Amino acid sequence: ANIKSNEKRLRQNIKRNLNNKGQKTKLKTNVKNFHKEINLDNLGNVYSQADRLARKGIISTNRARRLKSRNVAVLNKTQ
Amino acid sequence: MVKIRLMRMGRVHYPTYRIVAVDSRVKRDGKYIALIGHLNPALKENKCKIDEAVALEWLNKGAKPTDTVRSLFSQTGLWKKFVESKK
Amino acid sequence: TNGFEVLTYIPGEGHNLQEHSVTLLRGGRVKDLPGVRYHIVRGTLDTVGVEKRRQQRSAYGAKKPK
Amino acid sequence: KYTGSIFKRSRRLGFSLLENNKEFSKGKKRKTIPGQHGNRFRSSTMSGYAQQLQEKQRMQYMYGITDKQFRRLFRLVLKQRGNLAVNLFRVLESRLDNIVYRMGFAPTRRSARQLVNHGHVLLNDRTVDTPSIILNPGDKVRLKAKTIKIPIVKAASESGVVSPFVETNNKTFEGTYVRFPERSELPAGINESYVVEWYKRLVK
RNA sequence: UCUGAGAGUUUGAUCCUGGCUCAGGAUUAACGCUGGCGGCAUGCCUAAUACAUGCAAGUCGAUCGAAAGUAGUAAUACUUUAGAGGCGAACGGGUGAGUAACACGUAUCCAAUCUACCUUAUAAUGGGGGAUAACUAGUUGAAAGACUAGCUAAUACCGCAUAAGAACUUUGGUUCGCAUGAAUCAAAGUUGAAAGGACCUGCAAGGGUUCGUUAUUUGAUGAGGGUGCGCCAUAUCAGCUAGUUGGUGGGGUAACGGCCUACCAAGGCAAUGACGUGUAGCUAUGCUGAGAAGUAGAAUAGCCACAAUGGGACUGAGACACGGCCCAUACUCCUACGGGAGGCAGCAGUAGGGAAUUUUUCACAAUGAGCGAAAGCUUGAUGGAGCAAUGCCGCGUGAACGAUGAAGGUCUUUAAGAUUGUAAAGUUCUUUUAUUUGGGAAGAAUGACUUUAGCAGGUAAUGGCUAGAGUUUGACUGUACCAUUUUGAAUAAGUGACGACUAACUAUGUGCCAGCAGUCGCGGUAAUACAUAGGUCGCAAGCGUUAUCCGGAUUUAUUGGGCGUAAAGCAAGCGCAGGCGGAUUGAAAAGUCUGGUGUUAAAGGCAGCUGCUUAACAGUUGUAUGCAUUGGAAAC
Ligand SMILES: [Mg+2]
Ligand SMILES: [Mg+2]
Ligand SMILES: [Mg+2]
Ligand SMILES: [Mg+2]
Ligand SMILES: [Mg+2]
Ligand SMILES: [Mg+2]
Ligand SMILES: [Mg+2]
Ligand SMILES: [Mg+2]
Ligand SMILES: [Mg+2]
Ligand SMILES: [Mg+2]
Ligand SMILES: [Mg+2]
Ligand SMILES: [Mg+2]
Ligand SMILES: [Mg+2]
Ligand SMILES: [Mg+2]
Ligand SMILES: [Mg+2]
Ligand SMILES: [Mg+2]
Ligand SMILES: [Mg+2]
Ligand SMILES: [Mg+2]
Ligand SMILES: [Mg+2]
Ligand SMILES: [Mg+2]
Ligand SMILES: [Mg+2]
Ligand SMILES: [Mg+2]
Ligand SMILES: [Mg+2]
Ligand SMILES: [Mg+2]
Ligand SMILES: [Mg+2]
Ligand SMILES: [Mg+2]
Ligand SMILES: [Mg+2]
Ligand SMILES: [Mg+2]
Ligand SMILES: [Mg+2]
Ligand SMILES: [Mg+2]
Ligand SMILES: [Mg+2]
Ligand SMILES: [Mg+2]
Ligand SMILES: [Mg+2]
Ligand SMILES: [Mg+2]
Ligand SMILES: [Mg+2]
Ligand SMILES: [Mg+2]
Ligand SMILES: [Mg+2]
Ligand SMILES: [Mg+2]
């Protein structure tokens, strides 16, 4: 009633979830730090984490694009 | 991922094929997009009334043939026209 | 087999019904008795066939004399 | 699959298989409807349904046909161009076992069917076993060779008595057929055209 | 060029209104009687009831460590796979429970989207690091396993250098749009890649083919959203809706959006039917009809929804995942009593329900899929073979000769006679079927692979491209079919009806009793209507009965009916909305007509043709209907 392919796939996705969750948490904490003490310096780091995650697929590419566009709007308004 | 392939529409102990452009994930004997031409396992000669028109369009578009599908193209000579048009 | 009680005529001369028995009813409508609208298929399950019949047997259910 | 009392049914309708062999007979020269109730009154005034059904049986008993086969052929001929009153007559007379009897190679029609079923007949370029093939004038329906020697070939080879619509090239037993049968070769046993309308009501 | 049949029945008799019944087709059919075979097709309509047991998605050693086996003195050579990794498991298969609405059909706009592999084109594929499966050891157990500590490998993972082009912004131009708004720059800033494997050559260095990878580009397929129109019954369901209607800023989604959020408001739908109830998967189509249309949504094909019930999420290009994961409920089962296991609406099959619907089968041989360079491999999809007269089609139970009449049966026109009846008996003949003998295919009139020949690119080598040779492969299968092969009519006829509609009548028995019946109606001691018999008629390997749909039924009448006396004019009036509506002129062109283009999936429908011995059937070409857009016509 069980298939080795299905069992193996479940065992792999646990490890993938751990790694991807770590990457996603760094982006979350980084954008919150940025918008906390606003500073053009942070912005760069935001670009790096979002683009890297988008390539790997972890995050949908559109979400990175909207986050990128919207974060840059705050800087122009504040500068 | 259009794939020129066959579709059985004969009867018991008598197959009958039709060359047709269809997607890979569509079931055999289901829905398709364009008609190329029919086939008969026992037509002796001219067993594959080919079209020679849209088939070149779909192959140029990137259609992937099959082993038996390719075979038919070669005796008539359709493989030659496709490869020389690529060149 | 449902929950409907219907008065069904036993079509034939002589019956083995014993107040408690099983029958395989069919369609019909006897014109003499008001309310009866069904007929019992003869010679099928518990109900016996109609012997001593050589004419139109296929309907009453009797084994070919042979 | 057929009746084994052809005298009885021919005596009832009144018309035999066109030689009166089943009417003359060697006894009593009986021309009355069979059964005890044959010499009675109430002869004429058959209803339109009555005469139509009697006539319909005449057409389909002259050739040994089942009514369902008749309905198939009528459905076939019905659709084409128009007043096809010349086609279905050719269609009804195109039966393979019927042609062998008109060929003059069989003593009787249903005996010819038996020879057809047993494989003693051939066709232009193939062999035929089923006694229902619809023929078309032009096929060289050549006879068998091992059946020309059987202890019943004598009357079979006496095809000099033959209808003009079955040309044989006598003594060569080629046995083709052209010049489709006119109504003259289809005698007054069944020569009517409201049987077509009878099947028009019953068969679409 | 379409194209339509009626009859019986109220009365003493007639005409009309009017209801009932019948003559014809059809089905996923069932029952009774009977029963030989072949070619096609169909086969749980009920309990989306519960399921024993066995199968239904894997593949790559040419990604990687290790292990094992066989040879070898060794170095090593070959084979195999538990595990890591890639890819596929979201396709394919089944069922129709739910669903009355953008579910579906049709036409569309996505200036509001995604798309892995595949197509074209264009830059790169350099260099480091840290880990863990397998293994070892220990604890805990019968085992499943689980926990703990060390050891390793990469196309697993994580940094770094580098951007042809990318993404996000900045500067002003361009071309503009349908309101938000898109389109193109030149300059600049900011941000961001990966991995190698197989083989050949080369002393080496280096070079090369191919697979694969990252970043892009072109399309296409597939997925998603919105909108117009069409798409059940019911008023003996009149109000419904408080994220419901709108704006603002923000969040989220592939994307627009009360999808979500805080604030500000009070709207939205509804008699042209909201809301509620009941019912149902929708469509192409099947049956019926002259047609308009009625009816069921068999099989199959498109789309949607579901996977014991109800929720949530990971992985991924794509799932909120039939035979993946987590939780709860219900149910069953195992245990050594601590713990666990389970989802046949996948192929068979079992139990149960039912009037009722099949092998616990063979092979991937052909077609199709997934992985692989190939070898291959996996395929209850698929192709066959069983089963069943379930439906359509076809063939058989014999042929000739044979009594102005064998026997028997039934009537006797009380000797005669008829009738069954050329039927039989009897003489000859044949073997589709049936039983031996010999031959023996079609599908594989494909093929992938491997040695050769030639071309062809690049060339220093190898792969791709055609031809020939080979391994060439069958579940059906010693099957269809064939032959002068032995025997031989031998192995094969039932069912309904006979008063009228409706083709076909006599006797015996019974005596308003027993019984028949689709309708009128038969039976009260002379029954062609009951029972039996003889005869005869209608069908035939089928025949009747029952159930359902359509026609006939102009019997809900748009085509195509009526309201004085037969059903039907409200008791009458004032009357909004609705329907209809005098004459002439002008414009527009919503109806109306017509031309062009797109589409209306394939199968089916009708016509022609081909192939099965012809047919049934299969294939083949033709064949409309509607919608949208555009260009004209101006009579109503
Ligand atoms: Mg993702
Ligand atoms: Mg009367
Ligand atoms: Mg009828
Ligand atoms: Mg392995
Ligand atoms: Mg799965
Ligand atoms: Mg699925
Ligand atoms: Mg199927
Ligand atoms: Mg079902
Ligand atoms: Mg992929
Ligand atoms: Mg490494
Ligand atoms: Mg970097
Ligand atoms: Mg990598
Ligand atoms: Mg708003
Ligand atoms: Mg339902
Ligand atoms: Mg009509
Ligand atoms: Mg269906
Ligand atoms: Mg169904
Ligand atoms: Mg399952
Ligand atoms: Mg099953
Ligand atoms: Mg289930
Ligand atoms: Mg296969
Ligand atoms: Mg049948
Ligand atoms: Mg038949
Ligand atoms: Mg005889
Ligand atoms: Mg006698
Ligand atoms: Mg072969
Ligand atoms: Mg009776
Ligand atoms: Mg009687
Ligand atoms: Mg009717
Ligand atoms: Mg009507
Ligand atoms: Mg009227
Ligand atoms: Mg009145
Ligand atoms: Mg009045
Ligand atoms: Mg009144
Ligand atoms: Mg008024
Ligand atoms: Mg008004
Ligand atoms: Mg179509
Ligand atoms: Mg067909």
Side-chain angles (χ1 to χ4, degrees), chain C residues 20-42:
Chain C
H20 262 297
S21 302
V22 186
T23 66
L24 178 126
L25 321 178
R26 60 160 173 110
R29 206 272 299 185
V30 152
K31 291 200 51 164
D32 323 313
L33 323 167
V36 182
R37 294 126 52 192
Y38 313 89
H39 290 48
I40 305 189
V41 171
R42 272 279 194 162

mmCIF file of all heavy atoms in Angstrom, chain C residues 20-42:
data_model
loop_
_atom_site.group_PDB
_atom_site.id
_atom_site.type_symbol
_atom_site.label_atom_id
_atom_site.label_comp_id
_atom_site.label_asym_id
_atom_site.label_seq_id
_atom_site.Cartn_x
_atom_site.Cartn_y
_atom_site.Cartn_z
ATOM 1 N N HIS C 20 -48.006 -17.281 3.449
ATOM 2 C CA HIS C 20 -46.630 -16.826 3.634
ATOM 3 C C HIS C 20 -45.764 -17.462 2.557
ATOM 4 O O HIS C 20 -45.460 -18.658 2.626
ATOM 5 C CB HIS C 20 -46.092 -17.170 5.024
ATOM 6 C CG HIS C 20 -46.163 -16.040 6.004
ATOM 7 N ND1 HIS C 20 -45.464 -14.865 5.831
ATOM 8 C CD2 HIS C 20 -46.811 -15.921 7.188
ATOM 9 C CE1 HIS C 20 -45.699 -14.060 6.851
ATOM 10 N NE2 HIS C 20 -46.515 -14.676 7.688
ATOM 11 N N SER C 21 -45.359 -16.666 1.573
ATOM 12 C CA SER C 21 -44.553 -17.162 0.465
ATOM 13 C C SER C 21 -43.974 -15.962 -0.270
ATOM 14 O O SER C 21 -44.320 -14.812 0.006
ATOM 15 C CB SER C 21 -45.368 -18.036 -0.494
ATOM 16 O OG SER C 21 -45.951 -19.145 0.168
ATOM 17 N N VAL C 22 -43.092 -16.252 -1.221
ATOM 18 C CA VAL C 22 -42.386 -15.240 -1.994
ATOM 19 C C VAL C 22 -42.854 -15.345 -3.439
ATOM 20 O O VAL C 22 -43.010 -16.452 -3.968
ATOM 21 C CB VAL C 22 -40.858 -15.411 -1.889
ATOM 22 C CG1 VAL C 22 -40.139 -14.264 -2.584
ATOM 23 C CG2 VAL C 22 -40.429 -15.525 -0.432
ATOM 24 N N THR C 23 -43.072 -14.198 -4.082
ATOM 25 C CA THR C 23 -43.551 -14.179 -5.456
ATOM 26 C C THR C 23 -42.806 -13.102 -6.231
ATOM 27 O O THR C 23 -42.275 -12.146 -5.661
ATOM 28 C CB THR C 23 -45.064 -13.920 -5.541
ATOM 29 O OG1 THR C 23 -45.352 -12.597 -5.070
ATOM 30 C CG2 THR C 23 -45.846 -14.930 -4.716
ATOM 31 N N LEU C 24 -42.777 -13.276 -7.550
ATOM 32 C CA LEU C 24 -42.106 -12.365 -8.474
ATOM 33 C C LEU C 24 -43.158 -11.686 -9.355
ATOM 34 O O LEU C 24 -43.485 -12.167 -10.441
ATOM 35 C CB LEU C 24 -41.067 -13.163 -9.263
ATOM 36 C CG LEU C 24 -40.180 -12.605 -10.363
ATOM 37 C CD1 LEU C 24 -38.725 -12.906 -10.054
ATOM 38 C CD2 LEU C 24 -40.548 -13.187 -11.708
ATOM 39 N N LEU C 25 -43.686 -10.562 -8.875
ATOM 40 C CA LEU C 25 -44.764 -9.854 -9.556
ATOM 41 C C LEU C 25 -44.311 -9.209 -10.862
ATOM 42 O O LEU C 25 -43.139 -8.869 -11.043
ATOM 43 C CB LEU C 25 -45.340 -8.765 -8.652
ATOM 44 C CG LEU C 25 -45.492 -9.052 -7.162
ATOM 45 C CD1 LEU C 25 -46.043 -7.822 -6.471
ATOM 46 C CD2 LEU C 25 -46.412 -10.239 -6.955
ATOM 47 N N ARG C 26 -45.268 -9.041 -11.781
ATOM 48 C CA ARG C 26 -45.021 -8.342 -13.037
ATOM 49 C C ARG C 26 -46.058 -7.238 -13.217
ATOM 50 O O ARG C 26 -46.783 -6.904 -12.274
ATOM 51 C CB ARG C 26 -45.059 -9.303 -14.227
ATOM 52 C CG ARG C 26 -46.379 -10.033 -14.401
ATOM 53 C CD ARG C 26 -46.529 -10.581 -15.811
ATOM 54 N NE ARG C 26 -47.716 -11.415 -15.948
ATOM 55 C CZ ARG C 26 -48.791 -11.078 -16.646
ATOM 56 N NH1 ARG C 26 -48.870 -9.919 -17.278
ATOM 57 N NH2 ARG C 26 -49.816 -11.924 -16.708
ATOM 58 N N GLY C 27 -46.148 -6.667 -14.425
ATOM 59 C CA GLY C 27 -47.157 -5.671 -14.709
ATOM 60 C C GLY C 27 -48.457 -6.248 -15.259
ATOM 61 O O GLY C 27 -48.502 -7.366 -15.769
ATOM 62 N N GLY C 28 -49.519 -5.462 -15.150
ATOM 63 C CA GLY C 28 -50.812 -5.865 -15.661
ATOM 64 C C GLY C 28 -51.916 -4.999 -15.083
ATOM 65 O O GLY C 28 -51.660 -3.960 -14.475
ATOM 66 N N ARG C 29 -53.153 -5.464 -15.288
ATOM 67 C CA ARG C 29 -54.340 -4.828 -14.723
ATOM 68 C C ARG C 29 -55.591 -5.638 -15.044
ATOM 69 O O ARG C 29 -56.198 -5.463 -16.105
ATOM 70 C CB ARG C 29 -54.509 -3.401 -15.257
ATOM 71 C CG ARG C 29 -55.287 -2.468 -14.334
ATOM 72 C CD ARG C 29 -56.789 -2.528 -14.587
ATOM 73 N NE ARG C 29 -57.147 -2.134 -15.944
ATOM 74 C CZ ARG C 29 -58.393 -2.015 -16.381
ATOM 75 N NH1 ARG C 29 -59.429 -2.251 -15.591
ATOM 76 N NH2 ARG C 29 -58.607 -1.654 -17.643
ATOM 77 N N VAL C 30 -55.980 -6.532 -14.133
ATOM 78 C CA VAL C 30 -57.223 -7.280 -14.285
ATOM 79 C C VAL C 30 -58.418 -6.339 -14.229
ATOM 80 O O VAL C 30 -58.542 -5.520 -13.310
ATOM 81 C CB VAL C 30 -57.304 -8.390 -13.231
ATOM 82 C CG1 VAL C 30 -58.751 -8.712 -12.891
ATOM 83 C CG2 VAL C 30 -56.604 -9.606 -13.773
ATOM 84 N N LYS C 31 -59.309 -6.450 -15.216
ATOM 85 C CA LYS C 31 -60.435 -5.530 -15.296
ATOM 86 C C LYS C 31 -61.597 -5.912 -14.386
ATOM 87 O O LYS C 31 -62.446 -5.059 -14.106
ATOM 88 C CB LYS C 31 -60.940 -5.459 -16.737
ATOM 89 C CG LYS C 31 -59.997 -4.774 -17.706
ATOM 90 C CD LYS C 31 -60.741 -4.303 -18.942
ATOM 91 C CE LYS C 31 -61.972 -3.497 -18.563
ATOM 92 N NZ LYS C 31 -62.502 -2.724 -19.715
ATOM 93 N N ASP C 32 -61.664 -7.161 -13.922
ATOM 94 C CA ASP C 32 -62.802 -7.577 -13.106
ATOM 95 C C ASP C 32 -62.710 -7.062 -11.675
ATOM 96 O O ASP C 32 -63.699 -6.568 -11.125
ATOM 97 C CB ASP C 32 -62.927 -9.100 -13.107
ATOM 98 C CG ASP C 32 -62.572 -9.711 -14.439
ATOM 99 O OD1 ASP C 32 -63.064 -9.209 -15.468
ATOM 100 O OD2 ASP C 32 -61.794 -10.687 -14.458
ATOM 101 N N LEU C 33 -61.533 -7.171 -11.060
ATOM 102 C CA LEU C 33 -61.362 -6.803 -9.664
ATOM 103 C C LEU C 33 -60.842 -5.382 -9.560
ATOM 104 O O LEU C 33 -59.788 -5.078 -10.139
ATOM 105 C CB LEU C 33 -60.406 -7.766 -8.971
ATOM 106 C CG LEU C 33 -60.495 -9.231 -9.405
ATOM 107 C CD1 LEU C 33 -59.303 -10.020 -8.887
ATOM 108 C CD2 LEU C 33 -61.799 -9.853 -8.928
ATOM 109 N N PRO C 34 -61.529 -4.485 -8.854
ATOM 110 C CA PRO C 34 -61.051 -3.102 -8.755
ATOM 111 C C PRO C 34 -59.925 -3.017 -7.734
ATOM 112 O O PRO C 34 -60.048 -3.518 -6.613
ATOM 113 C CB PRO C 34 -62.290 -2.322 -8.293
ATOM 114 C CG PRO C 34 -63.443 -3.312 -8.342
ATOM 115 C CD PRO C 34 -62.823 -4.660 -8.180
ATOM 116 N N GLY C 35 -58.822 -2.380 -8.129
ATOM 117 C CA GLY C 35 -57.668 -2.191 -7.277
ATOM 118 C C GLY C 35 -56.476 -3.040 -7.670
ATOM 119 O O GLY C 35 -55.331 -2.623 -7.452
ATOM 120 N N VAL C 36 -56.715 -4.218 -8.239
ATOM 121 C CA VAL C 36 -55.625 -5.099 -8.639
ATOM 122 C C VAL C 36 -54.989 -4.550 -9.908
ATOM 123 O O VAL C 36 -55.674 -4.308 -10.907
ATOM 124 C CB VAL C 36 -56.134 -6.534 -8.850
ATOM 125 C CG1 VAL C 36 -54.982 -7.459 -9.213
ATOM 126 C CG2 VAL C 36 -56.853 -7.032 -7.606
ATOM 127 N N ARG C 37 -53.668 -4.355 -9.868
ATOM 128 C CA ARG C 37 -52.941 -3.834 -11.020
ATOM 129 C C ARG C 37 -51.632 -4.577 -11.265
ATOM 130 O O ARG C 37 -50.723 -4.014 -11.887
ATOM 131 C CB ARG C 37 -52.657 -2.335 -10.857
ATOM 132 C CG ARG C 37 -53.901 -1.459 -10.869
ATOM 133 C CD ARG C 37 -53.968 -0.563 -9.643
ATOM 134 N NE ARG C 37 -52.742 0.201 -9.453
ATOM 135 C CZ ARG C 37 -52.442 0.872 -8.349
ATOM 136 N NH1 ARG C 37 -53.258 0.891 -7.308
ATOM 137 N NH2 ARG C 37 -51.294 1.540 -8.287
ATOM 138 N N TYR C 38 -51.494 -5.812 -10.786
ATOM 139 C CA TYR C 38 -50.261 -6.555 -10.994
ATOM 140 C C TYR C 38 -50.578 -8.035 -11.154
ATOM 141 O O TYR C 38 -51.639 -8.514 -10.744
ATOM 142 C CB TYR C 38 -49.279 -6.349 -9.831
ATOM 143 C CG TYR C 38 -49.101 -4.903 -9.422
ATOM 144 C CD1 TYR C 38 -49.924 -4.326 -8.461
ATOM 145 C CD2 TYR C 38 -48.119 -4.112 -9.999
ATOM 146 C CE1 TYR C 38 -49.770 -3.005 -8.089
ATOM 147 C CE2 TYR C 38 -47.958 -2.791 -9.628
ATOM 148 C CZ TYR C 38 -48.785 -2.243 -8.673
ATOM 149 O OH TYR C 38 -48.629 -0.927 -8.304
ATOM 150 N N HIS C 39 -49.641 -8.754 -11.772
ATOM 151 C CA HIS C 39 -49.749 -10.188 -11.997
ATOM 152 C C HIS C 39 -48.500 -10.887 -11.475
ATOM 153 O O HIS C 39 -47.407 -10.313 -11.472
ATOM 154 C CB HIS C 39 -49.952 -10.517 -13.482
ATOM 155 C CG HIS C 39 -51.299 -10.128 -14.010
ATOM 156 N ND1 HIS C 39 -51.858 -8.889 -13.788
ATOM 157 C CD2 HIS C 39 -52.200 -10.820 -14.746
ATOM 158 C CE1 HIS C 39 -53.044 -8.832 -14.366
ATOM 159 N NE2 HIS C 39 -53.276 -9.991 -14.954
ATOM 160 N N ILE C 40 -48.671 -12.122 -11.012
ATOM 161 C CA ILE C 40 -47.560 -12.934 -10.524
ATOM 162 C C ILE C 40 -46.997 -13.749 -11.681
ATOM 163 O O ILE C 40 -47.722 -14.531 -12.307
ATOM 164 C CB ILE C 40 -48.000 -13.857 -9.377
ATOM 165 C CG1 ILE C 40 -48.644 -13.058 -8.247
ATOM 166 C CG2 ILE C 40 -46.816 -14.659 -8.857
ATOM 167 C CD1 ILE C 40 -48.910 -13.866 -6.997
ATOM 168 N N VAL C 41 -45.709 -13.565 -11.973
ATOM 169 C CA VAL C 41 -45.044 -14.428 -12.944
ATOM 170 C C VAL C 41 -45.057 -15.853 -12.410
ATOM 171 O O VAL C 41 -44.571 -16.124 -11.305
ATOM 172 C CB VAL C 41 -43.622 -13.942 -13.226
ATOM 173 C CG1 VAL C 41 -42.869 -14.964 -14.064
ATOM 174 C CG2 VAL C 41 -43.651 -12.597 -13.928
ATOM 175 N N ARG C 42 -45.614 -16.771 -13.193
ATOM 176 C CA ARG C 42 -45.772 -18.156 -12.775
ATOM 177 C C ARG C 42 -44.557 -19.000 -13.139
ATOM 178 O O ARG C 42 -43.945 -18.814 -14.194
ATOM 179 C CB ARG C 42 -47.028 -18.750 -13.410
ATOM 180 C CG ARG C 42 -48.283 -18.539 -12.593
ATOM 181 C CD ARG C 42 -48.391 -19.545 -11.470
ATOM 182 N NE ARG C 42 -49.729 -19.544 -10.894
ATOM 183 C CZ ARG C 42 -50.223 -20.519 -10.144
ATOM 184 N NH1 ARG C 42 -49.516 -21.600 -9.861
ATOM 185 N NH2 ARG C 42 -51.458 -20.405 -9.666
#
